[PDB]
Symmetry: D2
Subunit: 251 residues, 4 copies
């Protein structure tokens, strides 16, 4: 209760799975939230399922859309006042090795997972700096920002990029006394309705050679680390990586 | 409020600075706490300053004392019921390079910072495994478990050891379904009454070439990450390192 | 002598500084080498300065140019036989924070430093797999693939991407028995004619708070680690990062 | 040929497996070598198998024996002149989890793997500093200095300690202009006569979920990275970790 009192958050890809759980817990802790998706049908339903409009709203936007990012911040501030918190959660995957990645696949994934995170981080710093908000940018950067996977080549590129670009942003914000922190969160495998629709995936993710806990996580596992990072409890954490992975990367 | 309801925690070196703040926040969140120190004069005063005995007690014990560790767990369970949470926070430093470290200094520091953490982790696993407690062992492993410092040679050895030994323990507990998680916390420089008594230290720690935020942290900065790790909010986090350092290691 | 006997190497940006030294040592160790640059005036002069045409040639190509990559491999094989070794060394920098990076700057840097490395790695795997060549792809991925720099935001993104994308490629090549290794090299600051033309840069790079050795490196420092990685001496090294930085990242 | 001309090296545990291969390649490259073991029967045979006495000798010494370390340096200098190079390779393992490690096991393993490496590094700095030797201390610090293993608890502690203590030493030597570098080498699984005597071990080590190359390494794989680190080719490498692991840690 009340751990995010006063905060105003944007959560990209906030309509499903991890993003939806972040949104849910953010509201529970007193934040106002704007969630996004490119699909209005998913997004309108998502917001109402979490709370009322004084709590949470939806804004249609593809995170790869640079100009839209500006529209999104303006809509959030109109609704709730100045934005304090940004969670760059929208992302896609391609199940190709580097060798078998088409250039179109490469460009499409980087547009969402890398360009989109850049656009959001850049704008967030500009919009949040120097306002006494206790501002926090949380970038989703994966276990696949630490280790490779032979069939996630472009995804690995994007997650390693986010991991280190976030450090750059963290450092500049700290050195300039901007009152903006930047950190990354690195989920392991998480159970969602989507993973459920991939036959055998959860079982495969749960083998001990993959996740030593022997099972995969839940959306709220990622929500709770995001609450900590969004809150003023984490006012001395910047430039760091927060891993919640069931032991995946420990072996 | 209530984030640690039902938990029973031991915090070594829990009478001052970081440990005292962990203890304070743990009680605030509903945990019962046993704090330790080798000095009874510091410890008795510390516990009363935080809460009443149904909340928090003191047990005299040097973490390097293997047999005492057993006494400590028994006293904690007598007071509060079965222990769920262990924070291995006791530690010392020597301001010597590797070259200038005496063997006596080496052995003394390893006895507290490495042997003590081993004894606590080993016993904690034995005492906590298989009880449905949502058990959590939090080992303090420093920014100096990631980077070297030319004048902290033995300290660096100890912190690197804790960092990776904790992964081992995490993995075995996960693979065996013990219901015990093991993680490390890595503070940067934190302001305490002790740092204050070291002339020039805070200023030195606050230079941008050291801590990019331009200031050092506070004890509660470490308390709040420990609350997260002790709580069931972090049930999918094991084998990982949680850094709260003002950007120190990001550059 | 003879450590690269039989090898046929492409070195992008092989006409100056680090790339030129890699080329020089590669020839000295028996490799045939094709160096590239987008500028024919630099490139033709560079090759002749190292050796004769049976040893080393130049091919004009911007590493961001996807179609050219194909032309480059064909020209190298025409000259020297099947390519065994690729050093993705071409790169650019922008001295902007994330906040102050224009979208045009972002795209331009990623085109060279990320897309170019992807194109080369992807093609190299296809062209080198399954030929008994002891093939090796060496990707230049910087100290700035480990730590952030407040004024190198896009560069940091690119280097973190290369760092982890290379692991993906390494893993897939290993799992498929392709006889291709992929590793990254991470230079610290190196003295070149270019650094010399940046007033104050070497001195700034040589402060102990930056490079603890108190001086910066030389091009041959990077050449020698590349010889090791190109050679069959390193036949069990894949998916790893090789740092040569004067201690920069150790503190 | 000649890459270690003039060098005088001590290699602890230099009589078998990895250490023996390091010794072999060091002699081939022009170094004089003193190898150690606690067992004179293994050691005398080992030296003669590599070369003559003007090349390589044996000195009986347990690396956990502090006073002996002094005897060892004196004997090496008597034979060959001032020592330039130290490879701290002696080590033991215990196949126990943290939970199941006895205190006697803990102390015994730390005595060799941690205390021994400390004693050698400390003495090496004192004996090598300020002599224009291009001195290099190479500490064997394992894949198990990066990742945990549930059945190698004490070993993990020791290897994480070596990993970070070496950074400390590297930094102090660099800052003080000692002309001593300190780096760590991190082998994955390597085939030796000992591994061969552990039924099923190589096959187990070679599963793709362990070593993605699908096989384990050979002793010379570690020898060649040590030649690079001992040589002046690596004069700008200090405080770094060199991993040769078949992809083990990349996934
Ligand atoms: N689910 C897992 O097992 C898992 C594992 C590792 C990492 N991750 C990462 O965690 C993050 C969140 O996962 P998730 O559960 O919300 O994903 P999800 O699999 O449940 O669904 C995909 C999500 O991505 C968002 N999205 C995709 N493309 C978008 C675009 N162009 N614009 C805006 N939004 C877009 C959608 O809103 C959607 O919620 C992602 O970045 C993902 O890469 C997830
Ligand atoms: N204060 C900082 O700036 C800082 C910076 C980096 C890391 N750390 C680490 O954080 C942890 C906690 O710091 P702190 O503020 O509580 O320390 P502190 O400097 O305030 O005081 C030392 C603490 O260590 C404990 N301690 C020392 N030796 C002990 C022994 N033999 N047995 C039991 N307890 C013992 C004491 O209880 C005391 O509270 C330590 O492990 C320390 O190494 C602290
Ligand atoms: N010089 C340093 O201090 C330093 C420090 C850290 C990292 N690095 C990295 O090391 C690598 C090599 O450095 P360097 O000394 O050769 O660089 P350099 O500064 O001496 O010169 C730039 C080099 O990049 C190449 N290049 C740039 N854009 C290119 C393009 N579009 N197509 C083809 N080639 C292109 C050129 O051939 C040129 O040799 C680079 O990737 C750089 O990012 C260098
Ligand atoms: N062989 C592998 O698969 C493997 C895998 C990972 C790490 N390592 C590490 O690599 C290093 C070298 O391996 P190896 O092949 O030489 O070992 P080995 O298994 O072949 O034989 C053990 C070696 O350790 C030395 N040794 C053990 N205790 C000693 C003591 N008290 N004093 C002096 N010397 C002692 C012996 O000389 C012997 O050569 C070791 O530190 C080991 O921990 C080996
Ligand atoms: C790593 C995770 O995001 C994932 C990617 C592709 C397919 C399944 C899971
Ligand atoms: C790293 C921190 O624990 C410290 C150690 C010695 C002196 C001051 C601070
Ligand atoms: C990191 C190195 O490549 C660099 C980048 C920009 C300016 C100077 C040096
Ligand atoms: C990690 C390696 O040194 C090992 C340890 C114990 C048994 C087998 C192999
Ligand atoms: Mg640093
Ligand atoms: Mg792994």
């Amino acid at each position: 209760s009340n751990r995010l009192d006063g905060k105003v958050a944007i959560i990209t890809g906030g309509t499903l799975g991890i993003g939806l759980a972040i949104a849910t817990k953010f509201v529970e802790e007193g934040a106002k939230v704007m969630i996004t998706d490119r699909h209005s049908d998913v997004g309108e339903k998502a917001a109402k399922s979490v709370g009322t409009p004084d709590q949470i709203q939806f804004f249609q936007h593809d995170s790869s859309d640079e100009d839209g990012w500006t529209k999104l911040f303006d809509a959030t501030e109109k609704a709730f006042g100045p934005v304090s918190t940004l969670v760059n959660n929208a992302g896609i995957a391609v199940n190709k090795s580097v060798e078998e990645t088409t250039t179109a696949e490469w460009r499409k994934l980087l547009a969402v997972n890398l360009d989109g995170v850049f656009f959001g981080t850049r704008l967030g710093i500009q919009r949040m700096k120097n306002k006494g908000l206790g501002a926090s940018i949380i970038n989703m950067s994966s276990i696949e920002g630490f280790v490779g996977d032979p069939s996630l080549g472009a995804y690995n590129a994007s997650k390693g990029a986010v991991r280190i670009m976030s450090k750059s942003a963290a450092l500049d914000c700290a050195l300039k006394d901007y009152d903006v922190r930047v950190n990354t969160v690195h989920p392991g495998y998480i159970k969602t309705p989507l993973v459920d629709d991939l036959p055998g995936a959860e079982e495969a993710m749960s083998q001990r050679t993959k996740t030593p806990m022997g099972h995969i996580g839940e959306p709220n596992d990622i929500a709770y680390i995001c609450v900590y990072l969004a809150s003023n409890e984490s006012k001395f954490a910047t430039g760091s990586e927060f891993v919640v992975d069931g032991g995946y990367t420990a072996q």
